Design a protein around this ligand. Structure first.
Ligand SMILES: CCCCCCNC(=S)SC[C@H](NC(=O)CC[C@@H](N)C(=O)O)C(=O)NCC(=O)O
Ligand SMILES: CCCCCCNC(=S)SC[C@H](NC(=O)CC[C@@H](N)C(=O)O)C(=O)NCC(=O)O
Lengths: 217, 212
């Protein structure tokens, strides 16, 4: 079974946890706790660019978030049925990854920049990204973003809705089809299990967890 | 058959890697240059930009935005994305490293002047000690002409394009990496890439003060 190499936090590994869980794939995590443990991976040759996330799957030592996700999504048939469907999915999820990146990097922003950056994130959520995805759902009326079938785009989008809810639960309120997608995907057996207590799902990053990160990089 | 339409500004920016990839595939394409904020605004209000951003590429009945969506579709269509899922994972791992390094270089000009020379010094160190050894290691590992599967792939194209940008920043950074030197020569000599490198191609110059 796949072995996830990261530290005990959401970070750049959480979207992989979500996708594996949603595909009903059991995995182990081998958590890094120290710079000592990170250097073990580097000197043992496990990290091509000396960086985690790293996933052991099917014989490979995959680094780079998007290489991991792209491989898992094709393997478990959540990458669409042809390259035109993969292009819609890719366009959707990279928009998601652009917004996700902004939110992921808020706590490490310079303190004097944090007010502006948070404000900017909310403006783009409301005016750019949520209308973009509401218009997709409104355009075909179906229960899934692409191909009328569950795909990584639904998983990645619903994951981001949970992080937006944590930032401001009002932001999704004007977007009914996103609301309904969030509940429908949340109530899929594998996702509902992942959302319940005691799963590998990781909490928000507090301060102590934040520092113990900088102390490893 | 309609040939693909590239919507960007008349600059390298986030569109150049696609120019390289389409050209190396030997695919003819048109460019519609955005020259003002009104040109950008026209693409927004016409509904052509999913996230109100360019790059945008019209190809095969779609208006694809996001650099990585565009590149993935083009690389798959022209058989430059490996033969199976495992080869894509190697390719994806490689090109995302190139994307990481290409991003720092791309954002040198629009860094704070107090922090310019801190950033450039770190780009150079990561080149010498992180990225260039990883790819030299890949080429040494199998001793073949291409990074993956003994067949030209998007990895070779993206890597060699970056090799050109690294040379522009510091020609000495490559000198201790013979297999990267050789790949750069071999790839540049492919007929489609040699054309693209010759004058009058869609290849774009380094950005100056004027393009800012
Ligand atoms: C200051 C506090 C935190 C440090 C940086 C914020 N990122 C993290 S905490 S994630 C760990 C990080 N990995 C990546 O940046 C992934 C690359 C990316 N292309 C991908 O998608 O995989 C890492 O190993 N860095 C160590 C190092 O670079 O020497
Ligand atoms: C930036 C400092 C350095 C500037 C050099 C680069 N040039 C630009 S400005 S490229 C134009 C830009 N395009 C994107 O950001 C695309 C999204 C990206 N995730 C992709 O990969 O596609 C754009 O339209 N933003 C308008 C806007 O955000 O309102």
């Amino acid at each position: 079974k796949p072995k996830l190499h990261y530290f005990n936090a959401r970070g750049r590994m959480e979207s992989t946890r979500w996708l594996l869980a949603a595909a009903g794939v059991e995995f182990e995590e081998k958590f890094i706790k120290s710079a000592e443990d990170l250097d073990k991976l580097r000197n043992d040759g496990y990290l091509m660019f000396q960086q985690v996330p790293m996933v052991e799957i099917d014989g490979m030592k995959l680094v780079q978030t998007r290489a991991i996700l792209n491989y898992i999504a094709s393997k478990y048939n959540l990458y669409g049925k042809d390259i035109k469907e993969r292009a819609l999915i890719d366009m959707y999820i990279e928009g998601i990854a652009d917004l996700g990146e902004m939110i992921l990097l808020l706590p490490v922003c310079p303190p004097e920049e944090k007010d502006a950056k948070l404000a900017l994130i909310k403006e783009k959520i409301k005016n750019r990204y949520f209308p973009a995805f509401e218009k997709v759902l409104k355009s075909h009326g179906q229960d899934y973003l692409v191909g009328n079938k569950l795909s990584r785009a639904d998983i990645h989008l619903v994951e981001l809705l949970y992080y937006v809810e944590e930032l401001d639960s009002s932001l999704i309120s004007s977007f009914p089809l996103l609301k309904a997608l969030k509940t429908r995907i949340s109530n899929l057996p594998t996702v509902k299990k992942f959302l319940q207590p005691g799963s590998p799902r990781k909490p928000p990053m507090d301060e102590k967890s934040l520092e113990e990160a900088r102390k490893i990089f």
